[PDB]
Design an enzyme around this catalytic site. Structure first.
Site, short mmCIF file in Angstrom:
data_model
loop_
_atom_site.label_atom_id
_atom_site.label_comp_id
_atom_site.label_asym_id
_atom_site.label_seq_id
_atom_site.Cartn_x
_atom_site.Cartn_y
_atom_site.Cartn_z
N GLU D 82 0.81 -1.22 0.00
CA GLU D 82 0.00 0.00 0.00
C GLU D 82 0.85 1.27 0.00
O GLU D 82 0.69 2.12 -0.88
CB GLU D 82 -0.98 0.04 1.18
CG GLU D 82 -1.91 -1.17 1.36
CD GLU D 82 -2.85 -1.45 0.18
OE1 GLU D 82 -2.49 -1.19 -0.98
OE2 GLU D 82 -3.94 -2.00 0.41
N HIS D 86 2.44 1.05 -3.85
CA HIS D 86 1.31 1.68 -4.54
C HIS D 86 1.32 3.19 -4.45
O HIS D 86 1.31 3.87 -5.47
CB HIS D 86 -0.03 1.16 -4.04
CG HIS D 86 -0.23 -0.31 -4.27
ND1 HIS D 86 -1.32 -0.99 -3.77
CD2 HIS D 86 0.53 -1.22 -4.91
CE1 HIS D 86 -1.23 -2.26 -4.11
NE2 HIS D 86 -0.12 -2.43 -4.81
N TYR D 90 2.41 6.40 -7.70
CA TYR D 90 1.69 7.58 -8.20
C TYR D 90 2.60 8.78 -8.31
O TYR D 90 2.45 9.56 -9.23
CB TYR D 90 0.47 7.93 -7.35
CG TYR D 90 -0.53 6.81 -7.20
CD1 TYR D 90 -1.18 6.28 -8.31
CD2 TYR D 90 -0.82 6.29 -5.94
CE1 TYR D 90 -2.10 5.23 -8.17
CE2 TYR D 90 -1.73 5.25 -5.79
CZ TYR D 90 -2.37 4.73 -6.90
OH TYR D 90 -3.28 3.71 -6.74
N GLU D 183 -4.98 -5.06 -5.43
CA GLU D 183 -6.16 -4.71 -4.62
C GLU D 183 -7.23 -5.78 -4.70
O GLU D 183 -7.92 -6.03 -3.72
CB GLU D 183 -6.76 -3.35 -4.97
CG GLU D 183 -5.79 -2.23 -5.29
CD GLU D 183 -5.00 -1.66 -4.10
OE1 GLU D 183 -4.78 -2.34 -3.05
OE2 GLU D 183 -4.55 -0.49 -4.25
N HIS D 186 -6.24 -8.38 -2.26
CA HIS D 186 -6.37 -7.77 -0.91
C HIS D 186 -7.82 -7.75 -0.46
O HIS D 186 -8.11 -8.05 0.70
CB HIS D 186 -5.86 -6.33 -0.88
CG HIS D 186 -4.40 -6.17 -1.11
ND1 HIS D 186 -3.76 -4.96 -1.01
CD2 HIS D 186 -3.44 -7.07 -1.43
CE1 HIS D 186 -2.48 -5.11 -1.27
NE2 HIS D 186 -2.25 -6.38 -1.53
MN LIG Z 1 -5.01 -2.90 -0.97
MN LIG Z 2 -3.10 -0.23 -2.76
#
Ligand SMILES: [Mn+2]
Ligand SMILES: [Mn+2]
Ligand SMILES: [Mg+2]
Ligand SMILES: [Mg+2]
Ligand SMILES: [Mn+2]
Ligand SMILES: [Mn+2]
EC number: 1.17.4.1
Lengths: 86, 287, 683, 287, 683
Positions: D82, D86, D90, D183, D186
């Site tokens: 996360e 992730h 960005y 995701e 997850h």
């Molecule tokens: Mn996630």
């Molecule tokens: Mn994520």
């Protein structure tokens, strides 16, 4: 009663104390004389007083050194330092 | 000044247990004496138990109280390595070398062991004492964490490195070396976070935090000496292990920005073998 | 903690608000009594000591054989007749840790200060007892300090060479590059620093015998030389320090500069090669006018004109190169390159900025060659000729590679003894002896230039110490007046001694007749301008000393015209950062970095107050970082006008100042006549 | 019955944004209208915020309360992804495509955007309401996490997928597909943990938990509608995105073991196209 | 994609379960018609082409001036009379991309295959028209292939050297090391690979002029050599490749191997320097008994005995070194060192393993020197004498340094034409011409040894291709019988041609009288054992060719005794790499790595089936990794007994085979008489 400021043009803390001494002269300049001496141009006096760093503030009374303060000081601390000897 | 650099170094060191085949260790394991096998098992269990505390509590608790998105990410990555990589790696080594019943007994023994428990609970106690928005309690926990990462593990790491430097148990020794390399960077990073807190303190508070760190180090060190004799006297190595503990204690102190506590000593060579632009605007060419 | 270190640690323990500077004398006394005397092996007589040292391969038996034992004994007695006492703990510590002879196990001290001085004096005199005693008086009074190689290795058997520095011209060939690597390793084995001129090497992407875009430029040679100096690093006693110098109009100048970038990859980054940049006045002119400049490919210039790019006058040949379609070049921004230089000096202290036209405008030996590069310390500015090393079994065309024999005057001790003339002449004689006794078989060009040029380096030190101990601020005009007068006298007496040596030996340095000394152009400013002090305070310092007047300079010019000059180069001010401690002197003519240096030797810190630092002269010992660098440039330019070679000018900068301030200091140095700039130290 | 296979899947999916070179998107980005670039930046910024909180708070807090070292290892790994992978990706995209001022402005925009603040307030509030040994508060936070993983990201994911499907911004799109792949697993995993807790309850308690889940979904949904209109009206896509988020809301409910809540609709087909060291012995020396 | 490349990709497109091998000929036709015939410069006549090539500095004029134009035209007609056609697209691609002469802009092609072959033949013949036509027939039949340097650069002005290898002895001195760096660079700029023997260099921690722990070992010299080879990268078109060899009893052997570890830091790691380890039989004996071994400091042995460590028989002097207190050493584990070698070869393929006693057991020139090291390809094994390179203006003691004059026999085309004798003799003459015309001025020892020893290397290739195309498995005993007979024939005719050249020139190689050729000890196994084929199938392969018998070998021995031998060394089997494609042959005598080679060129994927591969002989072309390495060792040892130098023996290892398996292969190679082991290729 004289507040002698040992300073230099390259000294950052000495530039910070300059406006504090101008305010102190406006409030106390009838009872206190403020003297500035540039150590870069006046090494004999700085050597005589056993000054070994700047800024250095000497309180003199009738030619004798009664108090010594090293480094930057706010106005209120300089007023307390001088008022002991007035 | 440092979090992105540590981010880079951490993620580029990523590894998985499956990468090292362990079965070939049985070809040297079978040739060790009972005392050597016993010490190895006990050391391994010690490392496993301490590292679990770091994965479940130590890293996540520090990540929780530290402010900064990038720091939280690095700390999360370190917690992941403890739980997902290191813990599986220790389990893999055990399952390769001992049968299930032997593993259960060693863990029962080490779980009851006085010197292992003393240090494990001392560290955990400091993690449990962190208070929300209190940077002093956070600093104390960071000191504990650095002591675990950079100091307490090393009485244990000694033995796998000792074998690794001799050509014995090379597969598990390679794994241990990768783990140790992660703990080293963990210790350095948490150390920098502790120094940040330390540097925000008054001179009196600093002196007080220094006394805390040295006092804690002393308590842990005296217990390490006992832990060391308890495990290594039976294989005749305690003198050299003690030198290695002090050398690593000094590294831990340096991670916290403190002076070394112990005099410099040489280490066992077998273990060593195992181990402001401003543009010119013209008028500056004329004077 | 040792008692002497603890007593030295009491310097900063301030009582009554003052530093305890008197504890340093106590520190040195404790050091001697508790370590040096106890760990010094003593012999029943000097005969036993000399026999033991000669037989145990500590001393050369050759240099001691020219004196009868009574002469050596009396030289030692007149060395101990001074009863020299070290004034500071750091002086004795540095001497007995770096220069004093120790046994093969490095456990006992074989040489006192008065024994090192006596041995060096006996080496210098070469059979003359009176001259040996004169040298003993010179060194025990600490008026003259021989360079670290000379002081450490004179009269010793386990020695390298007495030459502190070597300058090699690298020609544009594989034979010449391989021979340059060989000579660099040979001279680093001898212990001396090696500087190499890479401006003759053809640029990256040039042609090798009709094979185009095959060269790796000078950077491959930098990697080779860097690994050569790492390999020949004097076994680890001190890491092999080498220097690479490149003209700023070389195409590889950006690649040459990128070697010192931190972001540079290991495949292009050098680590033991100090880099220096040679800046002609044409580059400064282009940067000032903001015109786009061109760096050139040296091999194209060689093919078109038959001479190497650094062998031609840049100010004259730049437009011809630019208008020549056969001379390949690439467009650069000279102001952007200057900013890159400033940022490189700010981040790493490199490169060494050398203003070629500032050197060659007052260079006396331009007929022999222009000064195309400096040494590792950016103070040896001498004419050099490149050697064309041919194939095996083919005779090589041996040129001139600069060998610099260094020596330092202690300005404080020279001035306090009122002995400028005698000290300068004795130092010139000692440097001449060092140059003569030095032969290097593995460097044909260094040996040839040592035999022919006979160039020596007579530096000076303790300028700031003398000024502060006399109540003179280093930036004050009085300090510049004293430097002008003192170094004019030093130049006068060095020239006089060189002419006297040329008269006595009947020989001058090779190609002397074409030099400005023979034509008299060197003495024009001396027979026209009077360099006597303009301040009465400064003139009082030279009391009891005959300041050379205009008439004396005319007489010296006539004497030089009649008899010649033995040395092509005589004066060069080296940093002398190591021997300064022993002599209790400030390093070079540079201002002091710190009033009380903090040094850690082991697990104990050892404070070194500046020589003569006290309460009355605290603010005279103003730290170099707090000083205006323009005033320091003015001081060095005042000194430089009396030094035929360069001065190791280090720039002491604050972190507040930007790269524009560094560029301004660089351009002010160029405008004031500064020849070389050594380092950009940031605080 | 499932943690080990999720552990293996998560670790085998490990990636870093630096594996994907982004300079290839430079031209298709340059060619988009100002409205399109604005929506794109804001969309990814909204995603960054969600991953920041999922990594800093959501995943670590759920890890703390879930029992079992292997379950904790999976959750710790997901937490690392996360914020360390992730959320950071960005910034890699932003740093390639946009000048610093536009980047600064979009991060300022997340702080003041009322829909993004509301959704963060709601989700993080539930995470921070978890009480030790209280399975109901944990269930509520897991529902919130599934809604973040499987529903809330999708108003953001729509646009990179919409471009990817047209052969535009394909390098950025490759990153986004990797994030989406993570995701999805997850959301399934956390969904299975939530179902474990739900299945322990009485029928009466279950009925209340369904009410909680549906009320929360509707509240988040209504806010997401306003967020979607705010971002997509300027590019003409709001109605299309709304269909997509409803589709994914049903997937979130299914991950929780609940029936779909919204009726099926045709999604833009463009978006659908967007989807050893053996030692020697004495017998080897004779032949 | 191009039409020829597209047709080549149809090889792997399987129809009816069989590879479309016939598509390859269509690929050659398409390649030629669409690319080559269009982009080859065509001239009105051969006279215009020759004038254009000599005038434009493409060809040398000296070798063409030895022939009248009629002779050159007849030679070219002979080359084109064969009407040679490439049978695979990869052959033509390799030739017309690497070896065909192209214009200075590389846009067009100046040389065909029949043109390069004609030019090479005209160079070889040296004014003889009949000899030139014989060479043309030899090369256009593809019976003999000159090495890549010789084939590429014969008769061309823009060239390097025709010599493939340079084996340099490095003495234990800084001057000798500097000269080693210089010679390495000067021979790398010529193109040939350079191998250096570092066993004479003293180890790390040795003394430099009586000061202890001063040396940094041979690792620093390897750093210098690696950066020297990186600098001499031959434009970067082919990176500078160099080898370093060290005796396994050298103290630095562990640090020597540590530089090839992947985990090794950049401060020790060398990249462009291949490493080889020389293993005497003593090390293998110590490992066999599992007794502690000792690695010795070479300079202590040199001081004690006056001779270098590698000049003394370790099987005899190991005990003397061990019981010598004045010889410095540290205990090591020989089995641990063997395991370290095995794992290093598994990880990186290094080091090359040289069994010194296997080399010197049958070395003919042990009187000149024992073979202390091999070349970069680990196949040249020649006597070498170290050169004592002294200081400048001092005469140097020049030794012997080895060079490769390489050429390969195509076993398939040699035995199809039934011309083993003619091919071997013509190849020997061509290699003799290459050795004679080589004059390297910057390498004194290389030039001296080329003039004195006159050593050549005559290898063979397409062994596996010939065996598989004749229905013989590589591991089968019939293959070993064929190799025995073929290489005994090759050795017989090479010795015969060497003796004939010695008779016709009246001179042998230097120090021939001490060689086993003069004493007759070399011919003992040839006059005592019959090497005729033991299999009827193999004997039919040699039908129509006179297989030398025991009596024929006796006559050859008498002829050599009476007339001498011109070449010290004649046969060495190089790896035969990129030129094996042009000859349509398998590389060297090694088995094929893969049946169909998958190669990437630009944006295209190209496929190269091994020559003669088809459905009938698919299983005869067994992949090398699938073979038993023990039977490959047997094959090479069968070949090795007829090769006076070594064979480039590459080990082909599976991923599943551990380091114990590699060590077993190495020890079986040592036991079977294998001289060198080149590479450990793991699949
Ligand atoms: Mn996630
Ligand atoms: Mn994520
Ligand atoms: Mg040349
Ligand atoms: Mg020697
Ligand atoms: Mn761990
Ligand atoms: Mn850790």
């Amino acid at each position: 009663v004289v507040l002698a400021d040992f300073w230099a043009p390259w000294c950052g803390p000495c530039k910070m104390i300059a406006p504090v001494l101008e305010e102190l002269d406006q409030e106390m300049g009838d009872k206190l004389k403020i003297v500035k001496i540039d150590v870069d141009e006046n090494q004999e006096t700085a050597g005589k007083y056993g000054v070994m760093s700047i800024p250095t503030l000497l309180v003199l009374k009738d030619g004798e050194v009664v108090e010594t303060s090293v480094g930057f000081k706010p106005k209120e601390a300089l007023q307390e330092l001088v008022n002991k000897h007035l | 000044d440092f979090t992105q650099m540590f981010y880079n170094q951490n993620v580029k060191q990523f590894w998985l247990p499956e990468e090292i085949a362990l079965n070939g260790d049985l070809l040297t394991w079978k040739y060790l004496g009972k005392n050597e096998q016993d010490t190895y098992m006990k050391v391994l269990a010690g490392l496993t138990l301490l590292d679990t505390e770091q994965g479940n509590t130590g890293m996540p608790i520090v990540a929780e109280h530290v402010d900064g998105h990038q720091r939280k990410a690095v700390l999360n990555f370190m917690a992941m390595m403890e739980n997902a990589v290191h813990a599986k790696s220790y389990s893999n080594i055990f399952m390769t070398l001992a049968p299930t019943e032997t593993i259960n007994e060693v863990f029962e023994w080490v779980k009851q062991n006085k010197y292992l428990q003393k240090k494990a609970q001392m560290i955990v106690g400091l993690y449990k004492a962190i208070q929300k928005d209190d940077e002093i309690s956070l600093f104390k926990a960071m000191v504990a964490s650095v002591y675990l990462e950079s100091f307490l593990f090393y009485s244990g790491f000694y033995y796998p490195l000792y074998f690794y430097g001799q050509g014995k148990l090379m597969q598990s020794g390679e794994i241990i070396n990768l783990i140790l390399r992660d703990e080293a960077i963990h210790g350095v990073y948490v150390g920098l976070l502790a120094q940040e807190i330390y540097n925000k303190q008054t001179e009196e508070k600093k002196a007080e935090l220094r006394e805390f760190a040295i006092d804690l180090l002393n308590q842990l060190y005296e217990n390490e000496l006992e832990y060391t004799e308890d495990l290594y006297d039976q294989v005749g190595l305690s003198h050299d292990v003690k030198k290695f503990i002090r050398y690593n204690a000094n590294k831990a102190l340096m991670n916290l920005g403190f002076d070394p506590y112990f005099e410099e000593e040489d280490i066992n060579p077998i273990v060593l073998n195992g181990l402001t632009v401003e543009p010119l605007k013209d008028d500056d060419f004329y004077f | 903690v040792p008692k002497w270190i603890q007593l030295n640690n009491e310097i900063m323990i301030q009582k009554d608000g003052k530093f305890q500077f008197d504890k340093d004398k106590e520190a040195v006394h404790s050091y001697f009594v508790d370590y040096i005397n106890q760990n010094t092996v003593f012999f029943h007589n000097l005969k036993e000591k000399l026999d033991y040292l000669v037989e145990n391969q500590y001393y050369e038996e050759e240099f001691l054989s020219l004196y009868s034992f009574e002469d050596i004994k009396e030289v030692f007695k007149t060395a101990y007749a001074k009863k020299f006492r070290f004034p500071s703990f750091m002086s004795a510590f540095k001497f007995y840790n770096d220069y004093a002879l120790k046994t093969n196990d490095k456990k006992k001290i074989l040489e006192r200060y008065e024994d090192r001085i006596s041995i060096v004096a006996l080496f210098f005199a070469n059979g003359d007892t009176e001259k040996a005693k004169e040298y003993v008086n010179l060194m025990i009074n600490q008026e003259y300090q021989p360079s670290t190689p000379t002081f450490l290795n004179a009269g010793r058997k386990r020695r390298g060479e007495l030459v502190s520095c070597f300058l090699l011209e690298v020609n544009d060939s594989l034979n010449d590059i391989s021979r340059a690597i060989d000579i660099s390793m040979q001279l680093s084995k001898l212990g001396g620093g090696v500087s190499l001129n890479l401006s003759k090497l053809r640029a990256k992407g040039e042609a090798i015998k009709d094979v185009e875009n095959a060269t790796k430029g000078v950077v491959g040679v930098m990697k080779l030389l860097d690994n050569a100096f790492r390999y020949a690093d004097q076994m680890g006693q001190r890491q092999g320090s080498g220097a690479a110098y490149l003209n700023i109009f070389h195409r590889d100048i950006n690649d040459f500069l990128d070697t010192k970038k931190i972001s540079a990859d290991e495949d292009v980054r050098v680590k033991t090669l100090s880099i220096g940049v040679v800046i002609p006045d044409k580059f400064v002119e282009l940067a000032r006018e903001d015109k786009a400049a061109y760096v050139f490919y040296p091999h194209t210039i060689y093919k078109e004109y038959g001479q190497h790019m650094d062998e031609m006058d840049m100010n004259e040949m730049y437009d011809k190169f630019v208008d020549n379609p056969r001379v390949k070049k690439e467009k650069i921004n000279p102001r952007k390159l200057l900013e890159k230089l400033a940022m490189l000096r700010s981040e790493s202290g490199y490169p060494y900025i050398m203003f070629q036209d500032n050197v060659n405008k007052v260079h006396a030996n331009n007929h022999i060659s222009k000064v195309k590069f400096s040494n590792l310390c950016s103070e040896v500015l001498q004419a050099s000729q490149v050697s064309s090393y041919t194939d095996y079994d083919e005779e090589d065309e041996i040129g001139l590679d600069i060998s610099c024999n260094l020596g330092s005057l202690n300005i404080l001790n020279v001035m306090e003894h009122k002995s400028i003339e005698k000290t300068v002449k004795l130092a010139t004689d000692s440097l001449t002896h060092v140059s003569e006794t030095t032969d290097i078989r593995n460097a044909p060009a260094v040996r040839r230039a040592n035999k022919a040029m006979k160039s020596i380096g007579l530096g000076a030190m303790n300028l700031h110490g003398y000024l502060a101990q006399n109540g003179i601020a280093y930036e004050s005009p009085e300090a510049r007046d004293f430097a002008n007068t003192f170094f004019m006298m030093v130049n006068f007496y060095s020239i006089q001694r060189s002419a006297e040596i040329a008269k006595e030996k009947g020989e001058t340095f090779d190609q002397y007749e074409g030099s400005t000394y023979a034509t008299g152009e060197y003495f024009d400013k001396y027979v026209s301008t009077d360099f006597s002090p303009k301040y009465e305070k400064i003139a009082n310092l030279f009391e009891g000393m005959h300041i050379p007047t205009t008439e004396d300079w005319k007489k010296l010019k006539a004497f030089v015209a009649e008899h010649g000059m033995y040395h092509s180069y005589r004066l060069c001010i080296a940093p002398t950062g190591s021997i300064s401690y022993v002599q209790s002197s400030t390093a070079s003519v540079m201002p002091i970095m710190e009033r009380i240096e903090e040094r850690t030797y082991g697990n104990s810190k050892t404070y070194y107050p500046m020589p003569g630092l006290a309460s009355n002269n605290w603010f005279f010992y103003k730290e170099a970082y707090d000083m205006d660098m323009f005033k320091v440039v003015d001081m060095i330019a005042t000194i430089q006008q009396h030094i035929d070679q360069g001065i190791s000018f280090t720039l002491f900068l604050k972190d507040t100042m930007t790269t524009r301030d560094l560029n301004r200091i660089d351009l002010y140095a160029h405008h004031r006549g500064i020849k070389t700039i050594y380092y950009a130290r940031t605080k």
